[PDB]
Symmetry: C3
Subunit: 318 residues, 3 copies
């Protein structure tokens, strides 16, 4: 049991003095509303570590000494702090390598003959946009007049692409891939009582759907699902906004976002590195209404003076 780390800087970030002078770490794997985020805390002997390149690519490997290190991601430095008497730092770093916190704010609008989530990310984001090679494997028949009027281009994925017209979208910024949820890639795990430090296995019935109904064009109708993984309920009818042709099948989007809050674990673990936001967990060795699949929201790998606390949050993956 001995954690180690390899911070590949690919240049003159610091002259590999980060191996000597770390104090803590955090990580994330967030599909929702944010990217990943390194944190560093670096000593000073009255000034030894210069302010690094704000926009330097960092490659991070974690794991134990005497074991092969896991793929952890690649990062680019955005924000920097300092401290008082101990002279700390917080060299934080976000996901995208070729584009970090710059050159992503070129927006526009699309025409009617644009197949959505093909002509939005595969066919539109390759012409020097937010993050180029990310793709969506949804290729449904979409010939609706659709455009971003004026949205921030990382909120333009949210107001029209990957939250409202999601139908389960991930928009995970690292590794340049925004997929859907419910397990596009075959990765199971097994957890028990003899692995886990703590829990928060919550449940909500404020956010139970029983039906999901949407809105259509004015010349206004609705198409609904009738079993949101529950048979104990009869009727719930909720509406937020209108639509033209997008919510003809995007009632499946609200099947997720209310039932993702229906069951949510938050369990702490010592260091594995076998934990990502696209993998499902089989929480074995628990009580009656807990055992089952859970899609992992976020994994928070940390160093400290204590070790690893890889906090894993999840949603109800049915």
């Amino acid at each position: 049991m001995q954690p180690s780390f390899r911070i590949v800087a690919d240049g003159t970030d610091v002259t590999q003095r980060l191996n000597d002078r770390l104090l803590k770490l955090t990580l994330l794997d967030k599909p929702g509303m944010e990217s990943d985020s390194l944190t560093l805390r670096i000593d000073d002997r009255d000034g030894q570590v210069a302010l690094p390149r704000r926009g330097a690519v960092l490659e991070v490997h974690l794991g134990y000494a005497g074991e092969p290190l896991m793929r952890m991601g690649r990062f680019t430095v955005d924000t920097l702090q300092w401290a008082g008497p101990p002279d700390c730092l917080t060299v934080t770093a976000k996901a995208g390598d070729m584009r970090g916190s710059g050159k992503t704010i070129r927006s526009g609008g699309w025409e009617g003959t644009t197949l959505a989530q093909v002509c939005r990310d595969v066919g539109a984001r390759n012409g020097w946009r937010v993050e180029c090679p990310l793709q969506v494997a949804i290729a449904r028949v979409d010939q609706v007049n659709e455009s971003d009027y004026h949205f921030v281009t990382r909120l333009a994925r949210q107001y029209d692409c990957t939250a409202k017209l999601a139908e389960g979208m991930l928009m995970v910024l690292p590794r340049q891939s925004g997929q859907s949820a419910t397990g596009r890639r075959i990765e199971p795990l097994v957890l028990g009582r003899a692995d886990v430090g703590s829990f928060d296995v919550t449940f909500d019935d404020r956010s139970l759907m029983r039906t999901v109904k949407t809105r259509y064009q004015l010349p206004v109708e609705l198409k609904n699902p009738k079993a949101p993984a529950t048979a104990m309920g009869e009727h719930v009818d909720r509406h937020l906004y209108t639509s033209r042709g997008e919510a003809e099948q995007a009632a499946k989007a609200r099947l997720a976002s209310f039932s993702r809050s229906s069951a949510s674990v938050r369990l702490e673990l010592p260091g594995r590195g076998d934990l990502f936001a696209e993998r499902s967990l089989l929480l074995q060795g628990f009580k009656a209404g807990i055992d089952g699949e859970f899609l992992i929201d976020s994994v928070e790998h940390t160093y400290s003076s204590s070790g690893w606390t890889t906090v894993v949050q999840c949603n109800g993956g049915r």
Copy 2:
């Protein structure tokens, strides 16, 4: 001095093992924005308490052993949690018995010949709506074109019925009764120094009205009160939204909601159970500008390993 409790489950919630395995409690009596809320914390001897019926009616009685227990309310379980090493629970439960967190989201719109707060709750909520037998004793002449366009039916009480067109409304979800404030029922009390644990007797002059002026139909006028329980002020003119015929007398609504923040106590007590959100307090035994009536906002009855902390918050009841 010995607190006791009777949790009547009226079914197979748990087989009365809750009498053996509690750890804490909370309660509320909230007129504003929420219902009441039980909390429970229940042991596990590596799994003894199964996950209860999410929607089981619970009747709660509190008080001391050797005294008659007080009416505390009836509750239906919505949310459930867990914990780490000690294996806790939070079996929380909201107000309404026949309708808890389900089957309340059927909305609609009304016509012009609808007397407001009679044809809204007495004459509209009896046809299988949010919570059926709750009534409003305001029967004023209201022949205005009024309708909910699309509101959540518990926010439809707030955006159009019991906050904007309130004139003092309570909308207290337990016991199926949403009344007005300023004491429709004759219940006084007396408190002193020898009863109370702590205080927070706040005051605000950021939210002092001196007049209250509203808006009318376009073919726009205003009718105002000139003494919001103060004579030290001269002029304050505030407007938020327009109205058709509702704010002809709903300038009395803003007389409350700014002067409810004018004086607000928050005093802790040991266990009584004689404290509800509809009762006025006479805080005797205090300083000069404190003694007087106070309508109770919320009462928070708790168990612990310490005992009772019945936190009582109030507003300025003039």
Copy 3:
């Protein structure tokens, strides 16, 4: 080293018993969104200090005993609290003397021939408005149709005058003067390592502009700056709202509000009283990318049982 204080009440607030019975203090010097704020904490020997005049003018002097006291400001009491067993108070007080938390809510609209920030504060706020003698030294050619439709008159400075059409505005409520930033008055200082208790020297690249582009009238164009004190960037294009003639030069407003978050120190000091929101700091004796000018956001002078903690926050003053 002995802090002293002179609370000039100019009347029968308390009979100078505040010199005997204080416990703590806070102050502010906030240009943004708030005024200054005293706090007091006053003992009770079961009731000795009556509730003071809510609207009594207080003059505050601070500094050390044996030194001339500094100008700290004048204040008017608004909010009051109490406490539990120790019987505290929080006699808080805001900036304006002639107008505190009252008689400031008279609004209106202006015509086309109104030179902005002359006919808005110098030529409009002298007719019994929010705070009378405050002035703006910006006298640019503004013949645009401009009016407040219905804004709160302290938000009417924010939605149209000193945040959106700011171009660096301060709107500092004490001493009746709302100026622009970037040092209209010649006041430098020098700080080092041997003066300062702690730090938070943050940086942000989420809020870096590279260009700043605005919007115009419909018969829509843009005029932009191309160097927001950076040469490491190439293109950032951000838009929020349209304009008629105001954002012809108000692209300089967004040059500040994004680069004010680009560098932000927050350093604690023992008591000086030589620190105001309009003064620039020269943080000497530090590392490479820290040394330079910093416009002070806010100074927080406090008493305690420990002494002074004059927390000084700043922005990047280029």
